[PDB]
Design a protein around this ligand. Structure first.
Ligand SMILES: Nc1nc2c(c(=O)[nH]1)N[C@@H](/C(S)=C(/S)[C@H](O)COP(=O)(O)OP(=O)(O)OC[C@H]1O[C@@H](n3cnc4c(=O)[nH]c(N)nc43)[C@H](O)[C@@H]1O)C=N2
Ligand SMILES: Nc1nc2c(c(=O)[nH]1)N[C@@H](/C(S)=C(/S)[C@H](O)COP(=O)(O)OP(=O)(O)OC[C@H]1O[C@@H](n3cnc4c(=O)[nH]c(N)nc43)[C@H](O)[C@@H]1O)C=N2
Ligand code: HEM
Ligand code: SF4
Ligand code: SF4
Ligand code: SF4
Ligand code: SF4
Ligand code: F3S
Ligand SMILES: [Ca+2]
Ligand SMILES: [Ca+2]
Ligand SMILES: [Mo]
Lengths: 409, 292, 1120
């Protein structure tokens, strides 16, 4: 069954016919702001994987690229199973138009084989290529922390556009893929994708610990629980999204790992066809946030703003060809992006639409070869019904107090 | 149809050698053990079943075991099947992510049928609107029966482990009560999945209407014991001839039905379709009771 | 009877699923009953406001409150939502510590001390010390005590020991033990001055923790009982310092501007447009506020990081400047030279507000004094000026501080100016100083003297800091130095941020002074987004700021008259009798083997470099709360082996068994932040918020009390044994369960908090039901804002930012100018050498040869030497193989000794974390690691993941007099795993600060337990197999930090002082002045066989295979 994947800009081989959700659970991670505090990591741990049998399980992990990973060297291990000289992107016939929800070819066309198509061509008699990480490969969740790549020449120093000595942080959960490898792997069809929000779940009543999801998931999110003799995965905290936490008063709430983000890098919502949704705007209209390893062919739905300082060659191989234009937009933010970026982690309630009330200009200069102007706009976020749920300003106010008070103390 | 081969005629025609269940008053203790039944099965005659890799559907696996001996005896009250195959490794637990269990299973068509290419009933775990009963023996369940809680837990696999809540000798009463409550344990334990609970049993009684459709029964009726010695497994299945569950195979002395077999080797990572299958239904006949 | 569905059929998992009733599994797990709010206050410096979720009265998880929008002050000013969410990973796992296996459960007393107390407190001869196990406290047993029993033994011991060393007979006992006469004379006959009471970083809770300073004050009564003296002649305990002891103060700040610390509310940093970071990891050590810096690259700002390593803060930098360690003074001197050669300075901003226009005399190197050139001169009457009415100057002080001379441009000739005549005050008068010029003058005596501008003197000073030599000193790219030099000159606001990456080296004082030079000239001090700032823990006890209109402030709680306490609940803070009788002391003297800086000079025999104001006293009793003092103490195994056995009573209040308890005599279980049964107040220096919390969490998990009651219970037993009621009077409202009285007495009486009520703040009157905002002049509190915008003087002798210091000790030390100096140990060249040829630097070498290897000799060797001559010198340690720096920065995974052992955080701080502990050699679910450059390890035959020994100067560390066969040497020598990180230079190694140190019992258990876990039978867990990160560290006694004539501002009051102030101009400890030797210890492979498993992959840094190199270069994917 050929299916359309807009990340690859191509039709793809999948066991099941294409059936997209009404809207897709998605999020944007601004890697440039990340600090690797692993606050999101402890958010998921203290909530879902804190008990017996899940001691090695870290559904949310932030890893130091390029050497780091959980499980150890997970990207390189899977990328080797699809290594071919034909894994190439072609950018010329990339859509100029912004295509409708679930369609199009924004980044171009990737003519390399996905994990499903590699399995098909070799006739390996499995739905996808993969491996089961051994229990020793699940050790060291912070493997390669703050380990940089170096040119190893004596006069080495780091400057823009690309740092000679460099490393960045990759924040990973279950991508809740449109065509997940784990769902196709399970022969019992015990993994299913919800049509309401696109959340992928393992049926704990029907799972039999077949480890095929663990085997064929290229992102290694499904993990086998020794105690229960069945596998578990990130549930996208679906009770919080279903509005079952009284803190958001029945409104859909961002997942627990997203709400925890300290360096205000992640915004969680849904991929609509609405261009006024800050999630849909960033991913399809600005193309500033890009999926993690679209080479695999699962259509991940966690999109990243690439680091401004990392080697562009490494970044394209990880996020596709859209990296160059995403960084150009970020380093000198447009007026509307800076206001939308100032919306990240201002509330825990999911915001479905944004709109801006304009304010006075505060600062302007020329930077990175072009002119940047900044205004103190007020960005506003709205809920599922159009009700306002959040509001903040781009620039901080200043208060002056009676002279009986002092600062120099 | 991508991941599955067409059903070949060799699969649809039943085998020719018949497995005869010999009638013999079986005197057994409470705790049934393979040794306790060895004297009985010695007087029965068994069929040598041929085993093959499962190549017919995705996933493909197996090939580690090629043959298995099967014998069967009955009381007029209880039926016992003994299955023997050679395997060099004792895989008795599946707690580590890379480890799998050795297993064996028998399957029976539910209800009374005659199978032929003209009246086909697929041996691939049944087929749609043609249900089947399954008896799945699990080696780890044998080890769970001997654990202090009816199930082996993680320290049995990782004896050096430490957890600040579960391995804390100073845990307050109400803290541990909430944290290790069924709701907070979650997963199979909260969802009452059998693979996560102390079943007090070694064989799972389950049904299927084809492969990819295997379903665990609500009322478990089959039990069994096992023995691994000198690179060989000996497993016997124990079930009453008749049970109150309509989804159970019903045996009648003097009646004949069919059966099929499969074996798993955890050393070669056998789970699901990676099973050492028999490709054909095998005939089964029950002797009449020697009424005094 | 209805037809059964025998099996469940699924068609397309993408489209539809037959049954989803199971999904309640996770919804049942996420369910909670109630929510509550507290404040996490572990010396984070953030004091986050926390919302925890409870299920059936069990604290299950936590989440941010998302409450900053609601924060407001008395005036109605409010905060923004841009402050959200702001929490750390350690905040999320605090409950794992609350219900954890390392928790303190009941009061503890050591067997060999209760034994000593039961035998009548006999004289502690060496025979008695070994018998009662004072020399070996790590192989004794900690026994359970009831609170009354624990209090009674402790109180009896306090009375005995304070009476033991009180008299003249006590003074001679201290001379017989080897203490200097200066330390015994400081006691002044008080035995209680041997009691050292430390409230550890009391701003975390002022009532519960700074109450220790109140306890110390109360001990004056015990002194009255011991010696039979009157209230005025009675002296109590000595308050142990916090800010300086940790090395957190920037020592140059009292010299440059005369204030304790220049820091900002970090929302202000996001106003900066070129932001410079020199000695600080803002990304890993101020994480909840780090978004204020990361977002500067998004609003037209430029970020600069100047570190030897490519740190997590370097990612965010526009350009990273590598530098050699302990050399930043030279870098900013070179940039200052570039700013002055090209006149890229705001002449107007430096004519005002700065000492550069002030003229300097050549005979004495002091600034010229109008008394010296004006006949019959009188000092101007500035009694109506802002130095008396705002800053609180006294006539006796003004007389010493004097007046200074400037050369007016309008009337050619010397002009006399005052401290208050700063900023726009000179334009209102006739003065228009000249920045340049060398003038001939004649004294009143007729003796001609040459006087020239500091800028002229700087112009001649900066000839040794040419762009090429500074690159030879700093190994920094010359293009980046000129790039930063230009950026500082073309951008406004410019801000320089630093921390203990540079403050933990000996010459930090010079470095911090160096950190104002480029910012004084460019006009970037006092304006939003600008300044030169240091970052540290939460030190600002001066938030309870005392003044005339306000009141006693912090003194109301800690310096209330013990013999005249106010027992009226409705007492205004101005109705309190303020008289403290606890003499502040710096902790580092204890860390210095209980000795001041005394060196037996060959030129002037035995000379003491410690000022009288800084003089310590012998430590015989010790008690500390909210600190892991011994575990986190520097040179720890020396402290345990040769220093602490002579401390007769060691006591610790804590919530966990920390290894400081393991080597202590008493342990008192306190309530954690979620089990507070009484209200508590805290503030921060990085945020303007006030958080008050208590009684709203869970009931105490074990037999714990609030710190306020532990202090009161200790005082009550002292009163019960001494038949004195005045003890309970000083803790009356604490005992009665009403600490809000003391909190109100602190709110009222503080410049930032008078008008606030504890009851009102706690109820949501200003927004959140636990938060308000303290009252500075500006919401983004920026230091010196009122000084530049309203033309007010700084807190220096000149009232101006100072690039020069004329105090006599400073000139004798050779540091009157901002000069670059090599470290006494952390340099490849001559230790403590002065790199300059300036004839105006005239230091005294003290006749100490350049061969001197003794640390106290190297401390005071002030030898001037040119840079070209210095490059040919040689550090003795560097040439014997100890040629690796060893930085001990702080980590994102710990707050010092907190969360360093919590399993979840303990798994992530290292490359080796494993909850199942498959490698039994691993100390716990984690082990501490050392970072080393791959080539460096390969040259010593060390592969990534191998165990390595970290050895330092044998003479000094791990402990003096060690021998390879001592049982304690096995405990002291550090053996940790090595980690390849090519982000570091060849000669630089890194260990994160504060894991739980190896003790006797952890080593015994690591070698006895089958699983190999380093877990003491007491429950204490070490993070190392052997040794600690404090095995290669030492205390350095700075002569520059022990001055008696440093006119700076008192931290707590709007007033001035001379000499030492605890946490304000005292010893600033330096753990990074060290070099280490690395040698392979054991193979990293499991069981000691082969190599550590990830190296076999070929996917490791320094061991990349051709495929990984294809990965690292992004060659796996091509576009067009
Ligand atoms: N080689 C080297 N040496 C160095 C440094 C370095 O970088 N390298 N750095 C310095 C510096 S800057 C610092 S800030 C110190 O490590 C911090 O000192 P501290 O002992 O207070 O940390 P800590 O986190 O342990 O203080 C908290 C302790 O109190 C416990 N606690 C936590 N909450 C409470 C409470 O509510 N009440 C009470 N009574 N105790 C509580 C806590 O468990 C810990 O023991 C110092 N030396
Ligand atoms: N989450 C969390 N937050 C916290 C703490 C925590 O433990 N956890 N600690 C507290 C406290 S009490 C403190 S004092 C601060 O975090 C200290 O952090 P800081 O970054 O300034 O020291 P650090 O030792 O890390 O040094 C910073 C960088 O300077 C490098 N360095 C070291 N030597 C030099 C040198 O000679 N020159 C230069 N230019 N840089 C040098 C150092 O490697 C580090 O990158 C409050 N914040
Ligand atoms: C060509 C023949 C067969 C194929 C392609 C096949 C395929 C599969 C598949 C896809 C599954 C997992 C999906 C599910 O559980 O519904 C499975 C599981 C299973 N089958 Fe079949 N099957 C075949 C024959 C058999 C036979 C002859 C038996 C013997 C009774 C059998 C017994 C079982 C058992 C016990 C399991 C569960 C395995 C476990 O829980 O670890 N199957 N098989
Ligand atoms: S990331 Fe892995 S587990 Fe998550 S949906 Fe995709 S394939 Fe499934
Ligand atoms: S989305 Fe929810 S379940 Fe998944 S990692 Fe984040 S917090 Fe955990
Ligand atoms: S909380 Fe946010 S900034 Fe911190 S590690 Fe996670 S994603 Fe990165
Ligand atoms: S640990 Fe520090 S940053 Fe984290 S919540 Fe507590 S106070 Fe805030
Ligand atoms: S393959 Fe299926 S049976 Fe469970 S372990 Fe994975 S969801
Ligand atoms: Ca086997
Ligand atoms: Ca049944
Ligand atoms: Mo600190």
């Amino acid at each position: 069954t050929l299916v359309h994947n807009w990340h690859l800009g191509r039709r793809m081989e999948y066991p099941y016919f294409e059936s997209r959700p009404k809207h897709q659970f998605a999020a944007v991670f601004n890697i440039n702001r990340c600090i690797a505090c692993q606050t999101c990591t402890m958010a998921c741990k203290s909530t879902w994987t804190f008990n017996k049998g899940q001691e090695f399980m870290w559904w949310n992990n932030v890893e130091t690229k390029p050497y780091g990973g959980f499980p150890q060297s997970w990207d390189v291990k899977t990328l080797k199973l699809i290594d071919s000289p034909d894994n190439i992107w072609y950018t010329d016939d990339k859509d100029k138009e912004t295509s409708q929800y679930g369609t199009g070819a924004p980044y171009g066309t990737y003519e390399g084989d996905t994990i499903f198509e590699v399995a098909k061509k070799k006739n390996i008699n499995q739905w996808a290529v993969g491996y089961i990480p051994e229990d020793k490969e699940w050790r060291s969740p912070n493997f390669g922390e703050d380990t940089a790549k170096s040119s190893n020449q004596p006069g080495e120093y780091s400057t823009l556009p690309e740092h000679s000595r460099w490393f960045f942080y990759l924040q990973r959960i279950c991508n809740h893929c449109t065509y997940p490898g784990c769902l196709a792997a399970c022969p019992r069809k015990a993994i299913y994708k919800r049509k309401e929000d696109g959340i992928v779940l393992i049926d704990q009543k029907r799972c039999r610990g077949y480890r095929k999801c663990v085997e064929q998931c290229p992102y290694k999110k499904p993990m086998y629980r020794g105690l229960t003799r069945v596998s578990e995965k990130c549930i996208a905290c679906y009770p919080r999204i279903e509005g079952r936490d009284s803190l958001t008063d029945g409104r859909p709430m961002e997942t627990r790992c997203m709400s925890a983000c300290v360096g205000q890098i992640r915004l969680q919502g849904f991929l609509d066809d609405n261009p006024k949704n800050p999630i849909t705007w960033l991913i399809r209209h600005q193309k500033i946030a890009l999926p993690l390893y679209p080479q695999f062919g699962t259509e991940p739905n966690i999109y990243y703003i690439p680091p401004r300082w990392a080697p562009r060659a490494y970044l394209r191989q990880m996020f596709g060809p859209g990296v160059d234009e995403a960084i150009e937009k970020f380093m000198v933010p447009s007026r509307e992006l800076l206001a939308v970026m100032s919306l990240f982690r201002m509330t825990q309630t999911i915001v479905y639409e944004y709109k801006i009330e304009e304010g006075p200009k505060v600062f302007e200069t020329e930077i990175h070869g072009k002119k940047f102007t900044m205004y103190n706009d007020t960005v506003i976020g709205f809920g599922e019904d159009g009700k306002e749920v959040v509001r903040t300003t781009v620039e901080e106010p200043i208060h002056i107090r009676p002279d009986k008070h002092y600062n120099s103390i | 149809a991508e991941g599955v081969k067409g059903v070949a005629e060799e699969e649809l025609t039943p085998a020719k050698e018949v497995l005869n269940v010999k009638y013999m008053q079986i005197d057994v203790p409470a705790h049934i053990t393979v040794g306790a039944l060895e004297g009985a099965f010695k007087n029965a005659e068994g069929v040598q079943v041929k085993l093959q890799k499962q190549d017919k559907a995705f996933p493909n696996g197996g090939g580690s075991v090629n043959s298995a001996e099967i014998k069967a005896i009955h009381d007029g009250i209880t039926i016992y099947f003994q299955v023997i195959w050679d395997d060099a490794t004792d895989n008795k637990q599946a707690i580590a992510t890379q480890e799998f269990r050795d297993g064996a299973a028998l399957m029976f068509p539910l209800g009374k049928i005659t199978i032929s290419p003209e009246e086909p009933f697929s041996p691939r775990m049944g087929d749609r609107q043609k249900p089947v009963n399954l008896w799945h023996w699990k080696a780890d369940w044998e080890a769970d029966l001997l654990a202090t809680g009816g199930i082996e837990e993680c320290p049995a696999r990782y004896p050096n482990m430490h957890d600040d809540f579960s391995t804390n000798p100073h845990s307050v009463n109400y803290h541990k009560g909430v944290i290790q409550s069924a709701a907070e344990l979650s997963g199979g334990y909260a969802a009452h999945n059998l693979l996560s609970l102390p079943r007090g049993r070694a064989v799972e009684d389950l049904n299927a209407e084809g492969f990819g459709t295997l379903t665990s029964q609500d009322h478990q009726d089959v039990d069994g014991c096992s023995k691994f010695e000198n690179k060989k497994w000996t497993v016997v299945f124990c079930r009453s001839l008749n049970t109150g569950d309509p989804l159970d195979v019903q045996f009648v002395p003097g009646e004949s039905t069919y059966f099929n077999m499969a074996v798993w080797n955890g050393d070669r990572e056998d789970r699901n379709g990676q099973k050492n299958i028999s490709i054909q239904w095998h005939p089964l006949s029950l002797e009449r009771i020697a009424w005094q | 009877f209805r037809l059964l569905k025998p099996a469940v059929v699924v068609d397309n998992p993408l489209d539809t699923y037959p049954d989803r009733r199971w999904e309640s599994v996770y919804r049942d797990q996420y369910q909670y009953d109630r929510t509550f709010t507290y404040c996490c206050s572990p010396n984070d410096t953030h004091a986050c406001r926390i919302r925890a979720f409870v299920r059936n009265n069990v604290m299950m998880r936590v989440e941010q409150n998302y409450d900053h929008q609601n924060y407001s002050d008395l005036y109605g000013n409010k905060a923004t939502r841009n402050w959200n969410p702001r929490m750390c990973l350690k905040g999320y796992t605090f409950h794992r510590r609350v219900y954890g296996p390392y928790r303190l459960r009941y009061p503890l007393i050591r067997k060999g001390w209760k034994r000593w107390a039961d035998d009548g407190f006999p004289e502690l001869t060496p025979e008695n010390k070994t018998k009662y196990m004072f020399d070996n406290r790590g192989n004794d047993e900690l026994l359970r005590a009831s609170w009354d029993e624990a209090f009674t033994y402790a109180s009896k011991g306090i009375i005995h020991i304070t009476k033991k060393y009180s008299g003249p007979e006590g003074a001679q006992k201290l001379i017989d033990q080897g203490y200097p006469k200066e330390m015994v004379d400081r006691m002044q006959g008080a035995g209680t001055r041997t009691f050292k009471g430390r409230g550890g970083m009391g701003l975390l809770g002022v009532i519960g923790k700074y109450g220790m300073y109140r306890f110390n004050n109360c001990l004056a009564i015990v002194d009255a009982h011991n010696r039979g003296v009157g209230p005025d002649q009675a002296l109590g305990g000595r308050n142990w310092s916090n800010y300086t002891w940790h090395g957190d103060q920037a020592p140059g700040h009292p010299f440059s501007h005369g204030l304790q610390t220049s820091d900002v509310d970090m929302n202000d940093v996001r106003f900066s447009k070129l932001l410079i970071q020199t000695g600080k990891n803002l990304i890993e050590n101020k994480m909840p506020e780090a978004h204020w810096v990361t977002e500067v690259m998004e609003r037209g700002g430029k970020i600069v990081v100047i570190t030897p390593e490519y740190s997590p803060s370097a990612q965010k930098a526009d350009y990273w400047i590598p530098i050699r360690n302990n050399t930043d003074t030279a870098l900013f001197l070179g940039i200052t030279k570039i700013l002055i050669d090209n006149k890229w300075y705001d002449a107007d901003y430096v004519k005002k507000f700065t000492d550069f226009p002030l003229l300097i005399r050549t005979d004495t190197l002091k600034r010229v004094s109008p008394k010296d050139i004006i006949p019959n001169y009188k000092l101007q009457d500035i009694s109506d000026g802002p130095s008396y009415h705002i800053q609180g100057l006294k006539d006796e002080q003004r007389e010493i501080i004097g007046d200074f001379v400037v050369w007016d441009a309008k009337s050619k000739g010397p002009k006399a100016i005052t401290r208050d005549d700063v900023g726009e005050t000179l334009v209102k008068k006739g003065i228009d100083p000249v920045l340049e010029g060398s003038f001939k003058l004649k004294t009143i005596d007729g003796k001609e003297i040459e006087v020239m501008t500091l800028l002229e003197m700087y112009k001649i000073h900066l000839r040794d800091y040419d762009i090429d030599s500074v690159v030879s000193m700093t190994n920094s790219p010359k293009d980046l130095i000129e790039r930063l030099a230009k950026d500082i000159a073309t951008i406004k606001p410019v801000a320089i941020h630093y921390g203990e990456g540079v403050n933990h080296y000996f010459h930090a004082t010079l470095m911090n002074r160096s950190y104002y030079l480029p910012v004084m000239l460019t006009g970037n001090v006092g304006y939003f987004g600008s300044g030169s700032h240091t970052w540290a823990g939460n030190y600002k006890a001066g938030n309870f700021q005392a003044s005339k209109w306000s009141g006693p402030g912090f003194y109301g709680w800690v310096a209330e008259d013990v013999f005249k306490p106010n027992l009226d609940p409705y007492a205004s803070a101005k109705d309190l009798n303020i008289k403290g009788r606890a003499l502040d002391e710096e902790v580092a003297y204890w860390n210095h083997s209980e000795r001041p800086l005394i060196v037996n000079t060959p030129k002037y025999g035995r000379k003491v470099f410690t000022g009288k104001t800084h003089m310590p006293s012998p430590t015989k009793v010790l008690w500390f709360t909210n600190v892991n003092l011994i575990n986190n103490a520097k040179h720890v195994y020396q402290m345990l082996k040769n220093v602490n056995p002579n401390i007769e009573q060691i006591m610790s209040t804590d919530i966990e068994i920390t290894g400081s308890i393991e080597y202590a005599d008493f342990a008192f279980p306190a309530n954690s932040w979620v089990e507070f049964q009484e209200f508590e107040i805290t503030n921060s220096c990085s945020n303007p918020f006030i958080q008050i919390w208590g009684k709203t969490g869970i009931t105490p998990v074990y037999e714990s009390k609030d710190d306020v009651k532990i202090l009161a219970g200790m005082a009550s037993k002292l009163g019960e044994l001494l038949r004195d009621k005045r003890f309970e009077d000083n803790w009356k409202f604490a005992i009665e369960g009403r600490a809000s009285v003391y909190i109100n007495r602190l709110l009222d009486g503080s410049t930032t908090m008078k008008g606030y009520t504890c009851e009102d703040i706690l109820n949501g009157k200003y927004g959140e039901p636990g938060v308000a905002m303290l009252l500075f002049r500006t919401y983004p509190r920026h230091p010196f804002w009122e000084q530049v915008h309203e033309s007010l003087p700084f807190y220096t002798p000149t009232g101006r930012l100072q690039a020069y210091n004329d105090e006599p000790e400073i000139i004798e030390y050779g540091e009157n100018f901002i000069v670059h100096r090599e470290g006494p140990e952390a340099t490849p060249y001559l230790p403590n050498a002065i790199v300059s040829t300036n004839p105006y630097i005239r230091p005294d070498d003290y006749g100490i040869p350049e061969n001197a290897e003794y640390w106290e000799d190297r401390t005071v060797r002030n030898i001037k030497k040119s840079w070209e001559e210095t490059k040919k010198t040689k550090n003795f340690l560097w040439e014997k193989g100890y040629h690796f720096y060893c930085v001990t920065p702080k980590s994102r995974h710990t707050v010092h000794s907190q969360w360093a052992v919590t399993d979840w955080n303990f798994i992530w701080n290292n490359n080796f974390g494993d909850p199942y502990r498959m490698d039994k050699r691993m100390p716990g679910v984690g082990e501490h690691q050392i970072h080393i450059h791959p080539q460096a390890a390969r040259d010593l035959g060390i592969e990534d993941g191998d165990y390595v020994y970290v050895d330092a100067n044998p003479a000094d560390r791990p402990y003096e007099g060690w021998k390879p066969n001592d049982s304690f040497y096995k405990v002291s020598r550090l053996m940790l795993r090595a980690k390849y990180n090519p982000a570091y230079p060849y000669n630089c190694t890194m260990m994160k600060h504060s894991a739980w140190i190896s003790s006797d019992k952890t080593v015994q258990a690591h070698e006895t337990r089958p699983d190999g876990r380093a877990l003491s039978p007491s429950g204490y867990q070490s993070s190392f197999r052997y040794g600690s990160q404090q095995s290669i560290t030492r205390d350095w006694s700075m002569p520059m930090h022990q001055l008696d004539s440093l006119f700076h501002k008192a931290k707590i009051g709007m007033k001035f002082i001379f000499g030492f102030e605890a946490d304000n101009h005292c010893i600033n400890t330096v753990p990074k002045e060290t070099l280490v030797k690395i040698t392979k210890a054991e193979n990293g492979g499991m069981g000691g066989k082969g190599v550590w498993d990830p190296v076999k992959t070929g996917y490791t840094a320094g061991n990349e295979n051709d495929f990984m190199k294809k990965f690292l270069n992004g060659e796996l994917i091509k576009v067009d």
